[PDB]
Amino acid sequence: NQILYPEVHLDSPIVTNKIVAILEYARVPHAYSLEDPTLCQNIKHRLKNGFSNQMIINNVEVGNVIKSKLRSYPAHSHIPYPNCNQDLFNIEDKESTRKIRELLKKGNSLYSKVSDKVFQCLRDTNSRLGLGSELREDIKEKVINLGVYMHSSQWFEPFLFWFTVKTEMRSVIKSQTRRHTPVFFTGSSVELLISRDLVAIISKESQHVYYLTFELVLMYCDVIEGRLMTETAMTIDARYTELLGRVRYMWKLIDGFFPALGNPTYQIVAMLEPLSLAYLQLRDITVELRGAFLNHCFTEIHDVLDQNGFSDEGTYHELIEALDYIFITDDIHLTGEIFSFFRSFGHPRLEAVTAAENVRKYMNQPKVIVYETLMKGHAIFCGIIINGYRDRHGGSWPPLTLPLHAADTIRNAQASGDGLTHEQCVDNWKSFAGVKFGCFMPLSLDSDLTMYLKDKALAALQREWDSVYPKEFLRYDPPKGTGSRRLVDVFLNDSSFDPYDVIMYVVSGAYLHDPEFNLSYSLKEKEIKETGRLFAKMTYKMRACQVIAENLISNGIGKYFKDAYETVSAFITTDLKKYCLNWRYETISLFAQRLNEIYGLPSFFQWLHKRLETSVLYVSDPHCPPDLDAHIPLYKVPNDQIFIKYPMGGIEGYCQKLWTISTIPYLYLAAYESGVRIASLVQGDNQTIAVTKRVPSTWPYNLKKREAARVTRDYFVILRQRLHDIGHHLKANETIVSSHFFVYSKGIYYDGLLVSQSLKSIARCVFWSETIVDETRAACSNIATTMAKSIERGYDRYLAYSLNVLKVIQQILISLGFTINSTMTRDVVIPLLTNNDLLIRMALLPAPIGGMNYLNMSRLFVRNIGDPVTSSIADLKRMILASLMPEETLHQVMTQQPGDSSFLDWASDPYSANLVCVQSITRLLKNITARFVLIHSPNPMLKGLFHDDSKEEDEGLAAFLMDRHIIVPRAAHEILDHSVTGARESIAGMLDTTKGLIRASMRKGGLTSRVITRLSNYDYEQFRAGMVLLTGRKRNVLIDKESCSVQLARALRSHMWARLARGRPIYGLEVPDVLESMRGHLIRRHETCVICECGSVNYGWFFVPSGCQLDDIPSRSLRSAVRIATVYSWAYGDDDSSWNEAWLLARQRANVSLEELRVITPTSLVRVARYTTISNDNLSTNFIYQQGMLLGLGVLETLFRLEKDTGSSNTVLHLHVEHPRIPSSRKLELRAELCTNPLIYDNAPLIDRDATR
Amino acid sequence: KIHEDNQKIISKLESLLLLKGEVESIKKQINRQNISISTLEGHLSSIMIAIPGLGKDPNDPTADVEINPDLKPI
Amino acid sequence: KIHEDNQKIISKLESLLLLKGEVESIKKQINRQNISISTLEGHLSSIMIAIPGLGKD
């Protein structure tokens, strides 16, 4: 293909049977032991028969080379995958790692040239804002000697070895895709063989032999690079001094446990995630909540040590003392940083039999439930639906039929139109015993296409289920597979698709009698748990019915379910992972009947359990074969190995919204019985219940938390009883009850404070990115994004900027010198590597003006910068003033060769400066592939949306909007996003092509050979364009030094766009820079220098008091037409002539007239920020003031970063601040016939009286 | 004697006029009875469709819903 | 003859008065069966549902 590279990072599970299959084809002896020897039989059977292909013959020679080398070492011992980790985390060879060492030493040389001037620029930036007096002395030595601290780490010599092995293995995979035999390379202490599928490492001193696959090499490279970056980040930053020692002891302790314990060490590694929450629970104010969950964690650690044979009292006590040293700290903010080190040890090896027997244990369990609790929850469920329909329809009762025995309260509430409380539902639960709702929720299916375009793997047919296993690993020849593998390939190629046809396929009952139904399991790519997790694959129609069912629940009833005295709350955190296995037909049946009555679909929402009770399920991995002599259908297969014969339960996912809306009524029932109030938050597999009771205001803070904890504990016991009465078995030991903290997506919430994992994004800052082609620009953008995310979670700004510059320099050096790309010619590599200043100026220049630095100095302080070009020019002026870059480079930026782009590319990206070869190439490949497959789709849902002449229409619309006498590029972007062009772009963007659709389009021939050759060489074009930019000598005499960045940005945009603009003005893209406009002064005592010296009175006032402890406490198309009409009437003027064009543009989305269209159209800052008073009265542009307040909060966060409390003085901070009409030149081409597709075009104007939305 | 017999006839007729209160009392007991049966039918209705395969051949008790959710493919 | 007719009226009134006691016996039997429905409704309120472990086919 020459456009597909082997994968850089690990997105696949680790399977033992792959390693065993390679080592048994290669006939190499190995030390693995399997729980199922089935593969270890089947291979032998094939080797008894004489079966061979090209992969067997290629693997015999590699094994012969390994045996010929192992004759030299007599006492050789193979070590399995977990038991060698402590060795393979610390391995070094000097001779094998010469080239990457020279490249990184050259990177140290360049950073040692520019580090002092980087520090001077950051010091001037700090001194402008007023924080120059509080600059630490150690920051200078950390910035200048950053490369020395990176190279002094203990993971540097492991990382060079594993990066070399990964890069050489990727070369072997792509080149082989002469019959050269791989030979060993004798190093100082390591002998290395690298093949396509196997790597053999022999240690010369210990005579230890390791065999590895590609997945293990990728995992080891990611782990060691993450450890290197994280240890460097903790060594440079002064706030992480004790955490550095604790995580070093953690690394040493777990790496010591790997050789003896092996694969059960990952249970302790997974137990490290509960332990931080338990050690944080130890500091609670309440009485017995301190050591509740720690007891369960310690008991399970003791069980893990006891089952594997370490039944000694000495070992467990030393492990408890070690964990007490690691997890006990005084700072609450540094407690949650251990969550960032969760993935630092690796991933366990997996086998399908263990996960199969776990799901077999859970889904084949008898149960007894109670009718009364089920009916009480059903009554609460009905009450929630009734209250939702009253709230959205003006107090009206929904269509329902109360029975004859209904209570007088319910009947009089139906007659008088009064709502129902929870107490009336629970007490009169027999009034809802025979209710029957009417149909009042529409089925909107022709107006949505966003869901089918998401890619979901499809299982094979039931007649051909052995096709996933190769002939190599089976005793019989499997049937050849004819079913399609992906959902989108079936969906786009479907000749006749009707959304109601699959609902008829459910309701008519054809799914129970379908000959080709099959569900399969597959192992998860990244789970620390040794049993792992599974995701399911099913056939086309059943997956479509699943998607339609979840859409119907989400768009309808589920939206109903979303939400001298003071109030206190206490939190319960529970796990919801194994709830899906616990659901049965009897519990979910009545809720599903009520949803069937509401939606008007007979027996639709009960589909999953009725289908699963009659079908056999299996776990599918290619290397794990079934124990069958011949091909046998699934119903005859025994209930052993990977097969679950007749399950009772729910698959993970697939019905989650229904289970959630069934679960909430039992929480409300336990609330009514316990007499408390509940606020409920559902994360991914984590549920937080906040218990509220009213308390007197005169009470102190100590007793109120005791009262909240008491009522929370009572509620928890009642909730456990009511969840056991329906059969969920909450298992109170695993859940946690706290009076302060709860966990959510951003981090831990502790009493109004946020504890965040700052070091996770630094561990995710690695070389390259997950793209099919290695690109330097995407990697540098990923580095900038990870450093910015770490700054927002609390890392230091200047150190992150220095690490960003160092990693950009090293990334450029790896992209030029150590790469698998064969298109890197010597005409660009030798000029870039010999000229040092050229490469440094390419690394330091911002990317909006043509460089490869994607992090701005304004971005370190505030999230949003306005204009990238103006900010880039201001940063370049700062670098010129700090002598980091020469003056003439600015002239080069203003004399850069313009690129070729049309009005459509300018309307898609309004801030682009017409630069040559900047766009990410994977995005271009995805857009071309998605556009080709959506144009050539015979699906009847896409009759007129995608035409062969769509691109000419889009370019005509863009040239109609932006070829007027004044060019406004931001308004045209808003018009095209809400028009048909942005509708097609949004439909094409939601389809993820991945590797499979790109390969499929390559076999179809949509991607021409010119496209492949052109897209294969853009990295060399980026380096050539950067070299031509930085080596050019052209000057403009209008460039004055220290001029305004706005005028320079206007001149740059006029120069680069001079072919299209032809001298016409451009408006609406220019804003002043955040750092240049604002100057700060700190009034500790005795007045302001700026106010007295300059007389400036335009400033914002910030106040922090002393003596505060910081450390502790209508349709969418109609709205689109309205937005198009509003933007066109505002930006291009309004009169009789302009409203006709606005009506012609807005008519294509909604069916309105001219008169109707006229009528209808009208963070880490919180540590300071709780104490901060901001007054804006002395201010005299809303974006500039908002970013000024964000900058002031960042400055006050930087001032009190290393200090526990404000000391003895109040803190005062001052941040001083320093078209009639546009007629249309073109004419509208439009379309001859208006498209009537229901996704985009609205047939009815609907509510014309309501002008809102 | 005949007039005295008429007083006896009226005296026996008074208790028959009082029978209307007893007859109205039977009406209230039957009204309370049909609610009590309706509770049992409501409990039988919920149990039958929660437990699958128990309907005693009613042609799919879940399918008793109304069908006009702008579907109508038939 | 009027006296003879009046005694016949009295005899028919006594027969209707004997019918009243049977009607009151109907009231006691209706009330007894009403309790029997009520205690059966309590036992159907206290039913626990059992779910098997494996589906059959």
Next chain:
Amino acid sequence: IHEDNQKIISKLESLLLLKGEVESIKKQINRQNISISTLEGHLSSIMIAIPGPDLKPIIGRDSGRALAEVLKKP
């Protein structure tokens, strides 16, 4: 007076016609009393003891297939 007396006897014969209707009511209550007694006999069969009495009856899924697994062997 005699003509009025024949009218009174005429209405009293119509009032004596209700005795067969009251016996017809009595047979209907007797028919219900058998029906409730069979249901009380059916209800007492599935009652068991629960360890921990309560005497909560348990209904199986199809014919009592789950009861062989959950219940203690006698």
Next chain:
Amino acid sequence: AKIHEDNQKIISKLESLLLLKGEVESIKKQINRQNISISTLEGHLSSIMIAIPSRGQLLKEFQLKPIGKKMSSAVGFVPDTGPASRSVIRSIIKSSRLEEDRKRYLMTLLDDIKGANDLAKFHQMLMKIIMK
């Protein structure tokens, strides 16, 4: 005339009893409808409870088994059993805001205590010191 006036009063009471005739007939219809309703209810009830296993069996420990006072849970921690509870008490002492000499003295007292009930007396004494 007085005897005739009394006879009209006799007639009016007999007509009132004739009005009662229709209401009693209406009762017979409702009792008849209830017997049909309970018979169909009997047919559905006879179909359901055919298990017939007033005590014959017991559940084989499917109850929730509610937590004891000695056993620990998410509601609270009570010291029990062997090795884990001593580690939890030691962690509560090491995580406390107490003085170091007092913590060492409590370590000596905790190493002295052997019995399970005396471990519970230490835990109530330990929480008293932390609250004080």
